[PDB]
Scaffold this active site. Structure first.
Site, PDB file in Angstrom:
ATOM      1  N   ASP A   1       1.464  -9.327   2.165  1.00 18.60           N
ATOM      2  CA  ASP A   1       1.617  -7.999   2.150  1.00 18.60           C
ATOM      3  C   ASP A   1       3.005  -7.707   2.165  1.00 18.60           C
ATOM      4  O   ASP A   1       3.487  -6.618   2.847  1.00 18.60           O
ATOM      5  CB  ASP A   1       0.886  -7.256   3.198  1.00 18.60           C
ATOM      6  CG  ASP A   1       0.572  -6.034   3.028  1.00 18.60           C
ATOM      7  OD1 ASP A   1       0.830  -5.203   1.830  1.00 18.60           O
ATOM      8  OD2 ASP A   1      -0.141  -5.198   3.664  1.00 18.60           O
TER       9      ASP A   1
ATOM     10  N   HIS B   1       1.049  -1.261  -0.061  1.00 20.08           N
ATOM     11  CA  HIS B   1      -0.087  -0.131  -0.056  1.00 20.08           C
ATOM     12  C   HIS B   1       0.914   1.183  -0.087  1.00 20.08           C
ATOM     13  O   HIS B   1       0.325   2.409  -0.350  1.00 20.08           O
ATOM     14  CB  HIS B   1      -0.911   0.020   1.002  1.00 20.08           C
ATOM     15  CG  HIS B   1      -0.142  -0.030   2.391  1.00 20.08           C
ATOM     16  ND1 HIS B   1       0.446  -1.122   2.993  1.00 20.08           N
ATOM     17  CD2 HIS B   1       0.194   1.037   3.372  1.00 20.08           C
ATOM     18  CE1 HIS B   1       0.727  -0.703   4.340  1.00 20.08           C
ATOM     19  NE2 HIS B   1       0.640   0.609   4.415  1.00 20.08           N
TER      20      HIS B   1
ATOM     21  N   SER C   1       4.625   3.431   8.558  1.00 17.32           N
ATOM     22  CA  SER C   1       4.482   2.111   8.229  1.00 17.32           C
ATOM     23  C   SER C   1       5.780   1.554   7.923  1.00 17.32           C
ATOM     24  O   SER C   1       6.377   2.000   6.881  1.00 17.32           O
ATOM     25  CB  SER C   1       3.384   1.848   7.074  1.00 17.32           C
ATOM     26  OG  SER C   1       3.144   0.412   6.685  1.00 17.32           O
TER      27      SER C   1
END
Lengths: 49, 163
Positions: B62, B40, B114
């Protein structure tokens, strides 16, 4: 006499129908069983953490 | 106090931010000869060496991973699987490891932090922060970690928001 459907089909023709029409189903169900076993094994090793 | 200084001294050269038109939205990780980087977070790698590579993808876990060359494998993070419960060091202070779950007290946590790895009292990476969910007073983390067998386990609580 009176003709029938599947009247002139030979035992060779039944073999080439069956081994190529049900064998595909055998291959797809062992693909399903293989995918299920792989999913359960990978989820089983995840449970520890 | 000194914990943030130790995080800044350990993560000085090995942590590279991700730029997107001047905005810092994520951080990659260089550990074990591997470059971990999430899905992302989209942007360009600030390092010139790590940007001109090809990262293999894993959308279920991910993670994008790549191969760090041999002239940089010594200057990586450390990693281990042996981890007890209790306290660990994080970039904004401390993080609690209880019942196999990482929890952070509230006040901190936004969009952009993140990919920050979780360190211990020795200096080894035990987890990689990917997401977080607000639980009452004390938020929970959605991270990845390893085990004794060698399987990358992704822990994700309910209704998490990606950072």
């Amino acid at each position: 006499h009176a003709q029938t459907f599947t009247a002139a089909v030979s035992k060779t023709a039944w073999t080439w129908l069956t081994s190529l029409l049900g064998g595909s189903a055998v291959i797809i169900i062992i693909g399903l069983v293989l995918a299920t076993i792989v999913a359960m094994y990978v989820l089983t090793n995840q449970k520890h953490n | 106090g000194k914990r943030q200084r130790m995080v800044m001294k350990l993560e000085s050269d090995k942590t590279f931010p991700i730029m997107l038109e001047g905005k810092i939205n994520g951080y990659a990780c260089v550990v074990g000869g591997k470059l971990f980087r999430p899905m992302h977070v989209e942007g360009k790698i600030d390092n010139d060496v790590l940007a001109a590579l090809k990262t293999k993808k894993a959308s279920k876990y991910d993670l994008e991973y790549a191969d760090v060359p041999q002239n940089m494998r010594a200057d990586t993070f450390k990693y281990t699987h042996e981890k007890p419960q209790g306290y660990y060091s994080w970039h904004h202070g401390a993080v609690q490891y209880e019942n196999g779950r990482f929890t952070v007290p509230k006040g901190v946590g936004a969009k952009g932090d993140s990919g920050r790895p979780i360190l211990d009292n020795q200096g080894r990476v035990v987890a990689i922060v990917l997401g977080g969910v607000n639980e009452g007073s004390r938020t929970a983390l959605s991270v990845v970690m390893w085990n004794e067998k060698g399987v990358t386990v992704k822990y994700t609580p309910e209704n998490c928001e990606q950072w």
